[PDB]
Amino acid sequence: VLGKPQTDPTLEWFLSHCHIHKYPSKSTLIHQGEKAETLYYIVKGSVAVLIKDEEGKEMILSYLNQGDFIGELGLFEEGQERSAWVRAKTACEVAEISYKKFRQLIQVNPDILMRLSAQMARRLQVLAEKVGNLAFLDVTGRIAQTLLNLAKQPDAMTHPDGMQIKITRQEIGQIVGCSRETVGRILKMLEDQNLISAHGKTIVVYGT
Amino acid sequence: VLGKPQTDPTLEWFLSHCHIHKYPSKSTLIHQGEKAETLYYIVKGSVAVLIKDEEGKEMILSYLNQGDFIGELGLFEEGQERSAWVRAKTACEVAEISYKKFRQLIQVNPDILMRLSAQMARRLQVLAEKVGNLAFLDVTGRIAQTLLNLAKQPDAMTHPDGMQIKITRQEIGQIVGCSRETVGRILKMLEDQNLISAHGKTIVV
Ligand SMILES: Nc1ncnc2c1ncn2C1O[C@@H]2COP(=O)(O)O[C@H]2[C@H]1O
Ligand SMILES: Nc1ncnc2c1ncn2[C@@H]1O[C@@H]2COP(=O)(O)O[C@H]2[C@H]1O
Ligand SMILES: Nc1ncnc2c1ncn2[C@@H]1O[C@@H]2COP(=O)(O)O[C@H]2[C@H]1O
């Protein structure tokens, strides 16, 4: 740890080879199907990784945040496509560099490949969990897990009745696979089970 | 890039530091929950990567084959646990190595980390549509989609009425995350729906 701020010059070395660019909230950094030729690094902000179906429904594969790489999957063979959309959820600052350039950096210092790889490992772990949720739990179950997750981060909040979070009906729906209005119906149901206290900023009692 | 008497120096080098053990079908290579300290590579055979619900219901994350690393997700951070179960589909020949050893190898030649990484990238790419479906489709939609997928595989046989496939009730269940019984019921519905013929094999449309 560099304490609160863990920057390390490996990072700064890395970053000095990139151009940093800003993106307002809801800007799309990456479009599914685009040719993959560029790697991103999130200096500031957080993003949504999402996929769409044939009707236009969107679901969230993951949230990523500062310190996270993005656009890394097309890096090990060329001629690939972006596997998903990536959208800024907040204002963002993101470093970017060509794949060839990045491939060059690796030669010099493979610890950058190690750090990237370690992120991919974590993503697969997390995907495995998310897959059991989606495959086994019913839409209420997925919603409760979700809540229980959003609250399990240092970006959440605290409260006598537990921890509070800032999430919307569309958000949750995109994470569990259901409408806006279903979520509302299910969030009322849980409040009723005195599982939560909602108000735009949900209050998860916490325990599971 | 040479490699006789088969596949490259870099992998032959890597295997000589492994120990190769033999797994019979249905045997478990990797148990979920367990401390991760070693890496595997499949020399021969195929395995199933899977997870289960509270009541043992099974969901296949992926099949893996000869050439595939297994057990890698624990390598990058200490104290990780196995994210899923891994079971021999067929008899397997599996090389195995400790993470500590593998990391020294990485020091000697980062090529081997590149090849490992390329596979993890692939595994995230392929899981993306599949995870999409879990949210977009219910079990029936997912069962239909699976049959469609299966019928577009190279191993699908032509049929005068369409494409014939070989798959059991339980593999479908394992593919969509439901019981073999549920699969039997829904296959019958799709049948009555004149979408498929279900019998000694499955004929899609
Ligand atoms: N199975 C599903 N059923 C309905 N909406 C879904 C499903 N999977 C993902 N979604 C969606 O997630 C969004 C949540 O908010 P909306 O109701 O505005 O629109 C919804 C669609 O984009
Ligand atoms: N399951 C996932 N979890 C986290 N990020 C993901 C997942 N699937 C894809 N991504 C990403 O979103 C990016 C889309 O472009 P790439 O495929 O080039 O690189 C991808 C990763 O950054
Ligand atoms: N989505 C996936 N695709 C392919 N293999 C996977 C996936 N998720 C997990 N695996 C694996 O199965 C192993 C379970 O143990 P590990 O978590 O150590 O390492 C894991 C990988 O080898």
The DSSP annotation for A50-87 comes to EEE-SSS-EEEEEEEETT-EES-GGGGSSS-B--SEEE
Task: For residue A128, list chain B residues with Cβ-Cβ distance below 8 A.
Answer: 51, 61, 83-84
Separation between Cα atoms, residue B75 and residue B41, nearest integer Å = 14
Separation between Cα atoms, residue A148 and residue A141, nearest integer Å = 11
Separation between Cα atoms, residue A126 and residue B69, nearest integer Å = 19
In angstroms, this model's resolution equals: 1.8
For an interface test with B, give the residue of A69, A125, A133 to mutate (most B CBs within 10 A): A125
Radius of gyration of chain B measured on its C-alpha atoms: 19
Report the separation in Å between the CA atom of A51 and the middle of ligand 1, taken as the mean of its atom positions.
11
CB contact under 8 A, B134 and A136: no
Which residues, other chains included, contact A125 with Cβ-Cβ below 8 Å and sequence gap of 6+? B73, B80, B83
Give the angle B76-B33-A138 at the CA atoms, nearest 5°: 110
Give the three-state DSSP class for B178: coil
Of B58, B63, B127, B129, nearest in space to B90 by CA: B63
Separation between Cα atoms, residue B107 and residue A101, nearest integer Å = 22
CATH class of B9-137: mainly beta
**Residue in the structure block whose two tokens are 């560029």:** A38
Task: For residue B132, list chain A residues with Cβ-Cβ distance below 8 A.
Answer: 51, 53, 59
CB B129 within 8 A of CB B62: no
Ligand nearest to the CA of A129: 3
> Packing angle between helix A139-150 and helix A169-176, nearest 10 degrees?
120
Return residue ranges of chain A for CATH 2.60.120.10: 9-137
Distances (CA, A) of B75 to A119, B61, B100, B102: 11, 19, 9, 9
B34 in contact with chain A, both atoms CB, cutoff 8 A: no
Helices assigned H by DSSP within B91-179? 99-108, 111-136, 139-151, 169-176
Return residue ranges of chain B for CATH 1.10.10.10: 138-205
CATH 3.40.50.2300 fits A138-205, yes or no: no
Of B189, B190, B168, nearest in space to B179 by CA: B168
Q: Left if phi > 0, otherwise alpha if psi is -120 to 50, otherwise beta: which for A69?
A: beta
Taking a contact as any Cβ pair under 8 Å apart, which residues of chain B between 89 and 108 contact chain A? 106
Distance from chain centroid for Cα A27:
15
Calculate the CA dihedral of residues B182, B185, B189, B194 and round it to 10 degrees. 100
With CA atoms as reference, the chain B residue closest to A110 would be B110
Separation between Cα atoms, residue A89 and residue A29, nearest integer Å = 11
Q: Left if phi > 0, otherwise alpha if psi is -120 to 50, otherwise beta: which for B182?
A: alpha
Distances (CA, A) of A55 to A60, A170, B148: 16, 16, 19
**Residue in the structure block whose two tokens are 């084959």:** B65
CB contact under 8 A, B128 and A53: no
CB B195 within 8 A of CB B145: no
* List of E strands, A72-200: 85-88, 92-98, 163-166, 196-197
CB B139 within 8 A of CB B145: no
Of B49, B132, B122, nearest in space to B88 by CA: B49
The pair of three-digit structure tokens given for residue A157, joined into one six-digit string:
């909040």
Chain B nearest-CA distance from A160, in A, is 31
Radius of gyration of chain A measured on its C-alpha atoms: 19
**Residue in the structure block whose two tokens are 């839409």:** A139
Separation between Cα atoms, residue A130 and residue A146, nearest integer Å = 9
CB distance A178 to ligand 1 below 6 Å: yes
Question: Beta partners for A208?
Answer: none
Separation between Cα atoms, residue B166 and residue B171, nearest integer Å = 10
Query: What is the helix (H) or strand (E) element at residue A175, kind and residue range?
Result: helix A169-176
CB B50 within 8 A of CB B62: no
Distances (CA, A) of B83 to A144, B51, B64, B135, B202: 21, 8, 15, 21, 33
- Ligand 2 site, CB within 6 A: A 30, 36, 49, 61-62, 64, 70-74, 82-84, 86, 123, 127; B 124, 128
Separation between Cα atoms, residue B43 and residue A19, nearest integer Å = 43
Separation between Cα atoms, residue A149 and residue A144, nearest integer Å = 9
Secondary structure of chain A: what % helix, strand, coil (to 5)?
Answer: 40, 25, 35
